[PDB]
């Protein structure tokens, strides 16, 4: 069907430029316009601009100077580029398509790209087990500690395990590095029969870790 | 630019009840308004187009009405899966603008948390830091107290809490309190306990371990 997939999340140094690629499928870029929207803590949902079927571009007023949108119809790719980023440009960026070729009712969205504007350095996380040791139900999880920037993705058993999974929001430590736990409750009788692995992925540092969690 | 004002900031209802979301415009925009849903860690989902028109795949319990400056999104019978934020968008006037959004919370019966405590792993101790974790699982309402004690010494300032958004199935919350100590400090003590206080508990619940069993 109709899909929009964006490039991975990333760190951007202050005053530097942001670059996101939207790869679409289920339709041709020559038939539909592609819009760009961001979502920030300070401004909320904000329409940035659009590239139309014929290649024309419109940019929202406060972005006309630092925004630039190009595309490759053959490769089905839209290229987003914004210059001289500051702290308040930290947001989640989306590419989106409307219901019809000329409109603005955004029926299809990309998964979003979390952009962090910071001078700090990218750092992969360390993953430690939360080993189980009430009433036939045991709890276990993974501690994902000391990474930057957000986000990190955690799944269980390659996606096969979802029931009872809680992945907590990341919290900022005094070191300026993030940390989170991801838990899951399982039958205790399965602890000897089943294997439980948290699949941790930190795209910005290309850190990819599978952590096996066993009772101590 | 058209200013879109959504009210209230937060809406709290029970399942089965009705709910209206208000979106007011700084000037007339006819019926050029669209509505969106945003679930936890998700992208916006188009609910209604042009004030009242239906969208493919959206449950019939969603509907919209209004024209001019006053618009309303409605859910005739809320389900737990409706837990999300809701935004409005105008496109009568360039550039298109969005409202600040309304949060939809669900009420439910009181549910006491299940508490679990996790000692630091031997793998972590090699780095010179100890993270003791306390898990409060599937509870309601959101308010909870976690009190850390190390050899009856009250811990303060050295813990952090994180709370999930409401679950889409049982409408509950889960909490994690993480106590962080140096390896030296952790090895210098024995009894580690977290005491949990919640409305669903008639008494504070304590989960403890002794270092190295």
């Amino acid at each position: 069907q109709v899909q929009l997939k964006q490039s991975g999340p990333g760190l951007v140094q202050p005053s530097q430029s942001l670059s996101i690629t939207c790869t679409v499928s289920g339709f041709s870029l020559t038939n539909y316009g592609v819009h760009w929207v961001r979502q920030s803590p300070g401004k909320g949902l904000e329409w940035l601009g659009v590239i139309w079927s014929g290649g024309n571009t419109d940019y929202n007023t406060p972005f006309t100077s630092r925004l630039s949108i190009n595309k490759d119809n053959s490769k089905s790719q839209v290229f987003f580029k914004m210059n001289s980023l500051q702290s308040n440009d930290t947001a989640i960026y989306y590419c989106a398509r409307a219901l019809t070729y000329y409109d603005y009712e955004f029926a299809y969205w990309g998964q979003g790209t979390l952009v962090t504007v910071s001078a700090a350095s990218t750092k992969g996380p360390s993953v430690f087990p939360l080993a189980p040791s009430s009433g036939g139900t045991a709890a276990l999880g993974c501690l994902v500690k000391d990474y930057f920037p957000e986000p990190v993705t955690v799944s269980w058993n390659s996606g096969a395990l979802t029931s009872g999974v809680h992945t907590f929001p990341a919290v900022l430590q005094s070191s300026g590095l993030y940390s989170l736990s991801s838990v899951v409750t399982v039958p205790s009788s399965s602890l000897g029969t089943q294997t439980y692995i948290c699949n941790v992925n930190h795209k910005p540092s290309n850190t990819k870790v599978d952590k096996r969690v066993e009772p101590k | 630019d058209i200013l879109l004002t959504q009210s209230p900031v937060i809406l709290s209802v029970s399942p089965g009840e009705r709910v209206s979301f208000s979106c007011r415009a700084s000037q007339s925009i006819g019926t050029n308004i669209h509505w969106y849903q945003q679930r936890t860690n998700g992208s916006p989902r188009l609910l209604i187009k042009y004030a009242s028109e239906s969208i493919s795949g959206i449950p019939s319990r969603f509907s919209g009405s209004g024209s001019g400056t006053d618009f309303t999104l409605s859910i005739n019978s809320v389900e737990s899966e409706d837990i999300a934020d809701y935004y409005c968008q105008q496109n009568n006037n360039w550039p298109t603008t969005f409202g600040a959004g309304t949060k939809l919370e669900l009420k439910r019966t009181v549910a006491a948390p299940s508490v679990f405590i996790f000692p630091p792993s031997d793998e972590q101790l090699k780095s010179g830091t100890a993270s003791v974790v306390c898990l409060l699982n599937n509870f309601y309402p959101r308010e909870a107290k976690v009190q850390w004690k190390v050899d009856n010494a009250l811990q303060s300032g050295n813990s952090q809490e994180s709370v999930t958004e409401q679950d889409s199935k049982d409408s509950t919350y889960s909490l994690s309190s993480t106590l962080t100590l140096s390896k030296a400090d952790y090895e210098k003590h024995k009894v580690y306990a977290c005491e949990v206080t919640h409305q669903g508990l008639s008494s504070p619940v304590t989960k403890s371990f002794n270092r190295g069993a």
Partner: peptide, 12 residues
């Protein structure tokens, strides 16, 4: 009232 990048939800 503000958008939280960590959860993509409104918080305060």
């Amino acid at each position: 009232g503000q958008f939280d990048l960590s959860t993509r939800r409104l918080k305060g």
